Design an enzyme around this catalytic site. Structure first.
Site, PDB file in Angstrom:
ATOM      1  N   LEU A  58      -9.586  -8.989  -1.409  1.00  0.00           N
ATOM      2  CA  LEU A  58      -9.372  -7.706  -2.066  1.00  0.00           C
ATOM      3  C   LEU A  58      -7.922  -7.429  -2.462  1.00  0.00           C
ATOM      4  O   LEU A  58      -6.952  -7.889  -1.850  1.00  0.00           O
ATOM      5  CB  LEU A  58      -9.860  -6.573  -1.166  1.00  0.00           C
ATOM      6  CG  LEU A  58     -11.266  -6.720  -0.639  1.00  0.00           C
ATOM      7  CD1 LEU A  58     -11.567  -5.524   0.235  1.00  0.00           C
ATOM      8  CD2 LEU A  58     -12.177  -6.781  -1.812  1.00  0.00           C
ATOM      9  N   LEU A  71       0.771  -7.440   2.479  1.00  0.00           N
ATOM     10  CA  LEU A  71       2.174  -7.624   2.854  1.00  0.00           C
ATOM     11  C   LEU A  71       3.064  -6.981   1.829  1.00  0.00           C
ATOM     12  O   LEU A  71       2.914  -7.187   0.617  1.00  0.00           O
ATOM     13  CB  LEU A  71       2.503  -9.098   2.914  1.00  0.00           C
ATOM     14  CG  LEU A  71       3.946  -9.530   3.156  1.00  0.00           C
ATOM     15  CD1 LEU A  71       4.558  -8.954   4.456  1.00  0.00           C
ATOM     16  CD2 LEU A  71       4.017 -11.005   3.187  1.00  0.00           C
TER      17      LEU A  71
HETATM   18  C1  LIG Z   1      -3.017 -16.334  13.725  1.00  0.00           C
HETATM   19  C2  LIG Z   1      -2.808 -15.255  12.673  1.00  0.00           C
HETATM   20  C3  LIG Z   1      -1.561 -15.559  11.855  1.00  0.00           C
HETATM   21  C4  LIG Z   1      -1.102 -14.324  11.063  1.00  0.00           C
HETATM   22  C5  LIG Z   1      -0.084 -14.620   9.963  1.00  0.00           C
HETATM   23  C6  LIG Z   1      -0.731 -15.458   8.859  1.00  0.00           C
HETATM   24  C7  LIG Z   1       0.239 -15.859   7.738  1.00  0.00           C
HETATM   25  C8  LIG Z   1       0.413 -14.765   6.684  1.00  0.00           C
HETATM   26  C9  LIG Z   1       1.461 -15.156   5.631  1.00  0.00           C
HETATM   27  C10 LIG Z   1       1.671 -14.103   4.542  1.00  0.00           C
HETATM   28  C11 LIG Z   1       0.414 -13.755   3.723  1.00  0.00           C
HETATM   29  C12 LIG Z   1       0.623 -12.498   2.848  1.00  0.00           C
HETATM   30  C13 LIG Z   1      -0.299 -12.494   1.629  1.00  0.00           C
HETATM   31  C14 LIG Z   1      -0.030 -11.321   0.668  1.00  0.00           C
HETATM   32  O1  LIG Z   1      -0.098 -10.126   0.968  1.00  0.00           O
HETATM   33  S1  LIG Z   1       0.361 -11.669  -0.908  1.00  0.00           S
HETATM   34  C15 LIG Z   1       1.025 -10.203  -1.670  1.00  0.00           C
HETATM   35  C16 LIG Z   1       2.522 -10.202  -1.373  1.00  0.00           C
HETATM   36  N1  LIG Z   1       3.108  -8.907  -1.698  1.00  0.00           N
HETATM   37  C17 LIG Z   1       3.891  -8.682  -2.767  1.00  0.00           C
HETATM   38  O2  LIG Z   1       4.159  -9.592  -3.554  1.00  0.00           O
HETATM   39  C18 LIG Z   1       4.458  -7.278  -2.943  1.00  0.00           C
HETATM   40  C19 LIG Z   1       5.845  -7.237  -3.617  1.00  0.00           C
HETATM   41  N2  LIG Z   1       6.799  -8.058  -2.847  1.00  0.00           N
HETATM   42  C20 LIG Z   1       7.313  -7.814  -1.630  1.00  0.00           C
HETATM   43  O3  LIG Z   1       7.000  -6.852  -0.976  1.00  0.00           O
HETATM   44  C21 LIG Z   1       8.265  -8.787  -0.999  1.00  0.00           C
HETATM   45  O4  LIG Z   1       8.917  -9.613  -1.990  1.00  0.00           O
HETATM   46  C22 LIG Z   1       7.520  -9.743  -0.041  1.00  0.00           C
HETATM   47  C23 LIG Z   1       6.960  -9.035   1.186  1.00  0.00           C
HETATM   48  C24 LIG Z   1       6.324 -10.437  -0.711  1.00  0.00           C
HETATM   49  C25 LIG Z   1       8.553 -10.771   0.418  1.00  0.00           C
HETATM   50  O5  LIG Z   1       9.670 -10.053   0.941  1.00  0.00           O
HETATM   51  P1  LIG Z   1      11.200 -10.281   0.439  1.00  0.00           P
HETATM   52  O6  LIG Z   1      11.078 -10.553  -1.039  1.00  0.00           O
HETATM   53  O7  LIG Z   1      12.099  -9.155   0.894  1.00  0.00           O
HETATM   54  O8  LIG Z   1      11.719 -11.659   1.125  1.00  0.00           O
HETATM   55  P2  LIG Z   1      12.332 -11.762   2.622  1.00  0.00           P
HETATM   56  O9  LIG Z   1      13.806 -12.099   2.505  1.00  0.00           O
HETATM   57  O10 LIG Z   1      11.919 -10.542   3.407  1.00  0.00           O
HETATM   58  O11 LIG Z   1      11.609 -13.080   3.213  1.00  0.00           O
HETATM   59  C26 LIG Z   1      11.802 -14.358   2.609  1.00  0.00           C
HETATM   60  C27 LIG Z   1      10.712 -15.334   3.033  1.00  0.00           C
HETATM   61  O12 LIG Z   1       9.414 -14.867   2.635  1.00  0.00           O
HETATM   62  C28 LIG Z   1       8.648 -15.872   2.012  1.00  0.00           C
HETATM   63  N3  LIG Z   1       7.699 -15.197   1.118  1.00  0.00           N
HETATM   64  C29 LIG Z   1       7.961 -14.655  -0.085  1.00  0.00           C
HETATM   65  N4  LIG Z   1       6.799 -14.133  -0.575  1.00  0.00           N
HETATM   66  C30 LIG Z   1       5.813 -14.350   0.318  1.00  0.00           C
HETATM   67  C31 LIG Z   1       4.441 -14.073   0.348  1.00  0.00           C
HETATM   68  N5  LIG Z   1       3.828 -13.423  -0.660  1.00  0.00           N
HETATM   69  N6  LIG Z   1       3.719 -14.435   1.441  1.00  0.00           N
HETATM   70  C32 LIG Z   1       4.304 -15.098   2.461  1.00  0.00           C
HETATM   71  N7  LIG Z   1       5.606 -15.405   2.439  1.00  0.00           N
HETATM   72  C33 LIG Z   1       6.389 -15.022   1.390  1.00  0.00           C
HETATM   73  C34 LIG Z   1       9.729 -16.626   1.293  1.00  0.00           C
HETATM   74  O13 LIG Z   1       9.283 -17.916   0.854  1.00  0.00           O
HETATM   75  C35 LIG Z   1      10.829 -16.664   2.344  1.00  0.00           C
HETATM   76  O14 LIG Z   1      10.482 -17.611   3.344  1.00  0.00           O
HETATM   77  P3  LIG Z   1      11.270 -18.996   3.431  1.00  0.00           P
HETATM   78  O15 LIG Z   1      11.046 -19.607   2.080  1.00  0.00           O
HETATM   79  O16 LIG Z   1      12.690 -18.514   3.735  1.00  0.00           O
HETATM   80  O17 LIG Z   1      10.654 -19.839   4.530  1.00  0.00           O
HETATM   81  C1  LIG Z   2      -3.112  -5.861 -14.628  1.00  0.00           C
HETATM   82  C2  LIG Z   2      -2.200  -6.430 -13.595  1.00  0.00           C
HETATM   83  N1  LIG Z   2      -1.742  -5.733 -12.527  1.00  0.00           N
HETATM   84  N2  LIG Z   2      -0.905  -6.599 -11.794  1.00  0.00           N
HETATM   85  C3  LIG Z   2      -0.304  -5.982 -10.589  1.00  0.00           C
HETATM   86  C4  LIG Z   2      -0.833  -7.803 -12.355  1.00  0.00           C
HETATM   87  C5  LIG Z   2      -0.049  -8.949 -11.801  1.00  0.00           C
HETATM   88  C6  LIG Z   2      -1.644  -7.704 -13.497  1.00  0.00           C
HETATM   89  N3  LIG Z   2      -1.902  -8.722 -14.384  1.00  0.00           N
HETATM   90  S1  LIG Z   2      -3.075  -9.856 -14.169  1.00  0.00           S
HETATM   91  O1  LIG Z   2      -4.289  -9.203 -14.563  1.00  0.00           O
HETATM   92  O2  LIG Z   2      -2.778 -11.023 -14.966  1.00  0.00           O
HETATM   93  C7  LIG Z   2      -3.057 -10.336 -12.592  1.00  0.00           C
HETATM   94  C8  LIG Z   2      -3.889  -9.763 -11.640  1.00  0.00           C
HETATM   95 CL1  LIG Z   2      -5.129  -8.537 -11.991  1.00  0.00          CL
HETATM   96  C9  LIG Z   2      -3.859 -10.091 -10.312  1.00  0.00           C
HETATM   97  C10 LIG Z   2      -2.998 -11.018  -9.822  1.00  0.00           C
HETATM   98  C11 LIG Z   2      -3.047 -11.210  -8.337  1.00  0.00           C
HETATM   99  C12 LIG Z   2      -1.875 -11.456  -7.591  1.00  0.00           C
HETATM  100  C13 LIG Z   2      -1.985 -11.549  -6.206  1.00  0.00           C
HETATM  101  C14 LIG Z   2      -3.238 -11.366  -5.593  1.00  0.00           C
HETATM  102  N4  LIG Z   2      -3.419 -11.435  -4.203  1.00  0.00           N
HETATM  103  C15 LIG Z   2      -4.756 -10.856  -3.936  1.00  0.00           C
HETATM  104  C16 LIG Z   2      -5.079 -10.813  -2.445  1.00  0.00           C
HETATM  105  N5  LIG Z   2      -4.002 -10.119  -1.723  1.00  0.00           N
HETATM  106  C17 LIG Z   2      -2.684 -10.711  -2.024  1.00  0.00           C
HETATM  107  C18 LIG Z   2      -2.373 -10.656  -3.508  1.00  0.00           C
HETATM  108  N6  LIG Z   2      -4.328 -11.085  -6.331  1.00  0.00           N
HETATM  109  C19 LIG Z   2      -4.243 -10.977  -7.658  1.00  0.00           C
HETATM  110  C20 LIG Z   2      -2.109 -11.597 -10.717  1.00  0.00           C
HETATM  111  C21 LIG Z   2      -2.149 -11.270 -12.083  1.00  0.00           C
HETATM  112 CL2  LIG Z   2      -0.977 -12.148 -13.123  1.00  0.00          CL
END
Ligand SMILES: CCCCCCCCCCCCCC(=O)SCCNC(=O)CCNC(=O)[C@H](O)C(C)(C)COP(=O)(O)OP(=O)(O)OC[C@H]1O[C@@H](n2cnc3c(N)ncnc32)[C@H](O)[C@@H]1OP(=O)(O)O
Ligand SMILES: Cc1nn(C)c(C)c1NS(=O)(=O)c1c(Cl)cc(-c2ccc(N3CCNCC3)nc2)cc1Cl
Length: 411
Positions: free
Chosen positions: A411, A159
């Site tokens: 992953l 995501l």
């Molecule tokens: C049946 C099958 C079902 C399929 C779906 C299954 C569920 C999957 C669920 C997801 C599994 C994904 C697992 C991974 O990949 S985890 C890795 C997540 N990716 C990153 O952290 C990359 C850097 N960040 C970003 O790209 C953005 O900040 C993201 C996309 C993370 C949020 O974008 P943005 O910062 O522009 O915010 P918004 O204004 O658009 O949206 C705000 C809302 O989003 C809620 N939020 C924030 N972070 C997350 C998060 N990591 N999972 C779920 N929700 C999250 C937040 O509480 C708020 O909701 P609410 O508090 O208002 O309610």
């Molecule tokens: C070196 C480094 N690079 N990055 C980008 C960071 C955060 C570090 N420092 S870290 O080593 O200490 C660290 C590590 Cl590797 C990984 C994660 C982490 C977070 C999210 C995640 N999910 C895995 C499955 N898919 C959704 C995301 N997995 C792993 C957090 C930390 Cl804090």
């Protein structure tokens, strides 16, 4: 209040989660027929895209989005740099559904602005063992055992919303549309991990690191010299000596996995994973795909003795961009994947993991405290970091368990 997650079939609080006794769905039972066939409405300047994952150029576009906008540490020192070959490997496992890869594109230029992906997984996610006990105790066994059979569900990952589009409520829309495409194929549960706290985790494990190259790790500030090292003439000397490793593996019997190894590995892997409350079930094809060596991506070794695979270990590679140094572009990190040991202590199998990883030029070995990972932390000199990886279900009531009851690597 979570304006999005309050509307979703997930438990809403800790005090709710710490109360659930049996595994099972949250939602109303629905049918594919119930599910809208039209993609979810988005603003007119945008469109939905299904990237083709066997196209270098689509893969490249996703790569570029994640390289610049995927997960960063909190200090903005590192960002994940998943390579293109990594992404195809992770997004196209056997029987993958292309439609579960959801992209948002600007209509005008076709610039990719958002992504989320789902991949199939067969997951054992029934009531955990301790809770099956308290069920028998209470005459409630059949209810507790109802959802014991492996479920074919969705694994959500990757995501990511472009930096320029943050806090525009876009991520909810991506998730609703991913849900839609998955419900359309008659799947009603998902599993996912996140570094952040969301409603509501079922397990949570601390991160762990093992320096292979301490000089670089201190230079990029991944690591600090601990105060106790100042009591020395030459801090960096002591640090380096402290993490040194043999040049070659210690187990005779150790080589890379080959295709002929698949059924033995599958077998020893499943026997091991089956003792965990939550863990995947893998076909021969899934074992080939997630474990056969692929250059720069996944590295897998077996202990063969007498023409028998008694033990294996695996790791995979994810470089992070070093954002704020100038001397180093990249952190070269090895992540402990699956493994199994039958003939030797686990700390002994994993030492050879460090040894290989180091000899192949990795800076650090990372892991979460799932599986039996806790068992080798001290003797192999792993250190806890400040992360917490949290594990979640979508539409699935599940009791709080210990991270050492989880056997799913994401992953
Ligand atoms: C049946 C099958 C079902 C399929 C779906 C299954 C569920 C999957 C669920 C997801 C599994 C994904 C697992 C991974 O990949 S985890 C890795 C997540 N990716 C990153 O952290 C990359 C850097 N960040 C970003 O790209 C953005 O900040 C993201 C996309 C993370 C949020 O974008 P943005 O910062 O522009 O915010 P918004 O204004 O658009 O949206 C705000 C809302 O989003 C809620 N939020 C924030 N972070 C997350 C998060 N990591 N999972 C779920 N929700 C999250 C937040 O509480 C708020 O909701 P609410 O508090 O208002 O309610
Ligand atoms: C070196 C480094 N690079 N990055 C980008 C960071 C955060 C570090 N420092 S870290 O080593 O200490 C660290 C590590 Cl590797 C990984 C994660 C982490 C977070 C999210 C995640 N999910 C895995 C499955 N898919 C959704 C995301 N997995 C792993 C957090 C930390 Cl804090």
């Amino acid at each position: 209040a979570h304006a999005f997650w309050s509307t979703q079939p997930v438990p809403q609080t800790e005090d709710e989660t710490e109360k659930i006794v049996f595994a099972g769905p949250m939602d109303e039972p629905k049918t594919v027929a119930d599910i809208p066939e039209e993609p979810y409405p988005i603003a007119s300047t945008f469109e939905w895209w299904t990237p083709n994952m066997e196209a270098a150029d689509d893969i490249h576009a996703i790569y570029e989005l994640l390289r610049d906008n995927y997960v960063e540490d909190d200090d903005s020192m590192f960002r994940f740099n998943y390579s293109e070959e990594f992404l195809q490997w992770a997004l196209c496992p056997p029987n993958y559904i292309p439609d579960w890869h959801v992209a948002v594109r600007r209509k005008a230029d076709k610039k990719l602005l958002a992504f989320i992906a789902g991949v199939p997984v067969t997951l054992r996610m029934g009531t955990p063992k301790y809770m099956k006990v308290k069920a028998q105790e209470k005459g409630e066994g059949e209810e507790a055992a109802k959802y014991d059979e492996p479920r074919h569900i969705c694994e959500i990952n990757f995501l990511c919303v472009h930096k320029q589009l943050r806090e525009k409520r876009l991520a909810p829309i991506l998730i609703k549309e991913a849900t839609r495409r998955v419900n359309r194929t008659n799947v009603w549960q998902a599993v996912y991990t996140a570094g952040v706290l969301l409603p509501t985790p079922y397990a949570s494990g601390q991160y762990f690191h093992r320096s292979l190259n301490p000089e670089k790790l201190v230079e990029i500030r991944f690591s600090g010299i601990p105060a106790q090292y100042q009591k020395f003439q030459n801090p960096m000397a002591m640090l380096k000596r402290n993490y040194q490793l043999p040049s070659a593996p210690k187990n005779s019997g150790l080589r890379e996995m080959k295709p002929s190894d698949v059924p033995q590995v599958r077998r020893i892997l499943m026997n091991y994973l089956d003792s965990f409350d939550v863990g995947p079930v893998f076909s021969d094809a899934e074992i080939s795909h997630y474990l056969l060596p692929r250059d720069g991506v996944v590295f897998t070794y077996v202990v063969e003795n007498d023409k028998k695979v008694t033990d294996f270990f695996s790791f995979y590679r994810i470089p992070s961009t070093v954002i704020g140094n100038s001397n180093y572009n990249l952190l070269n990190a090895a992540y402990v994947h699956y493994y199994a040991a039958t003939s030797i202590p686990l700390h002994q199998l994993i030492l050879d993991l460090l040894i290989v990883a180091h000899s192949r030029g990795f800076d650090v070995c990372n892991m979460v405290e799932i599986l039996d990972n806790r068992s080798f932390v001290e003797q192999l000199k792993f250190g806890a970091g400040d992360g917490h990886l949290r594990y979640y279900f979508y539409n699935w009531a599940y009791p709080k368990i210990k991270p050492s009851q989880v056997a799913l690597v994401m992953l």
